[PDB]
């Protein structure tokens, strides 16, 4: 199914289509990163937990979290070591939410990172990015709807209408950290929209 992801003046946007079995398929990986997957939803959360191991054993071990190029190549390794998801025919693509803390820039400080079967990944630099079910209707529409994309409201609001023409779930992730956006404020824009 299909999730979306883009970037606003001060952070990244990340939201998904949902449907006591996990439902959610967007989650926060670690205090600035979320992983989207176009799949199955207990496919999302359990690569979401190993991937939040991951980077949590690197920041114990180490004494820092790993930079965003570090914590691209992890999701990278697992993308290309998923052999559970391939034997059994399941889709586990992931789309990366990122903010580098490190970035001089805290405005444009938002990553949206794409992952292709065989591990490969390319940062996006348009500033929007769709993938599952209805990528290209979700894309299509954000590409008409964002230079309406002023701040997080704004990026949330065209965030919803992407899944709306292709409740859902959503995390917004700035310099304070990534955030679960609550479903009331969800439901409200969904509805208006």
């Known amino acids: 199914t299909t999730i979306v992801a883009l970037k606003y003046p001060g952070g990244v946007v990340m939201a998904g289509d949902r449907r006591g079995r996990d439902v959610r398929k967007v989650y926060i990986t670690d205090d600035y990163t979320a992983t989207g997957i176009a799949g199955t939803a207990a496919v999302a959360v359990e690569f979401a937990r190993l991937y939040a191991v991951e980077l949590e054993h690197y920041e114990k071990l ?38 580098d803390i490190h970035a001089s820039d805290p405005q444009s400080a938002g990553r ?44 949330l609001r065209v965030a919803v209408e992407a899944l709306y023409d292709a409740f859902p779930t959503a995390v917004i992730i700035d310099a304070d950290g990534a955030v679960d956006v609550p479903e009331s404020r969800i439901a409200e824009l969904a509805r208006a929209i």
């Open 62 to 99: 180490e004494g820092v979290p790993l930079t965003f190029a570090g914590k691209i190549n992890r999701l990278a390794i697992m993308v290309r070591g998923n052999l559970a998801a391939a034997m059994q025919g399941l889709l586990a693509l992931p789309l990366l939410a990122g903010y």
């Open 112 to 155: 949206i990172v794409s992952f292709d079967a065989a591990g490969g990944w390319n940062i996006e630099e348009e500033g929007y990015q769709a993938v599952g079910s209805g990528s290209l209707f979700a894309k299509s529409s954000m590409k008409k709807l964002y230079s309406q994309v002023t701040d997080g409201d704004s990026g």
